[PDB]
């Protein structure tokens, strides 16, 4: 999803379904990568 080489087009975009797994969102928050990162629905620290 995030590290994929080529995303689909915004005209027709690829929707990746993520289910039945362990999602660790702290690695993304600790290591600085995203230039613009904002969570409207929930808090970025409460994601985990």
């Amino acid at each position: 999803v995030f590290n994929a080489t080529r995303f689909a087009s915004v005209y027709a975009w690829n929707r990746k379904r993520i289910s039945n797994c362990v999602a660790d969102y702290s690695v993304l928050y600790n290591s600085a990568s995203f230039s613009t990162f904002k969570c409207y629905g929930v808090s970025p620290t409460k994601l985990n």
């Binding site: 629905g41 929930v42 808090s43 620290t45 409460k46």
Partner: protein, 49 residues
């Protein structure tokens, strides 16, 4: 008017400064609920006496 009625849901989702906005809406309404109940009991209390 709040996102959710449960307080733990707001605390587990919004940031501390953002949660205050949603918590205030719940407190404001729940405050009116008590005022309505009490006001109704005092009136009925005058009828029973």
């Amino acid at each position: 008017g709040a996102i959710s009625s449960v307080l733990n849901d707001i605390l587990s989702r919004l940031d501390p400064p953002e949660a205050e906005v949603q918590i205030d809406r719940l407190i404001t309404g729940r405050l009116q609920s008590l005022q309505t109940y009490v006001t109704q009991q005092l009136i009925r209390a005058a009828e029973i006496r």
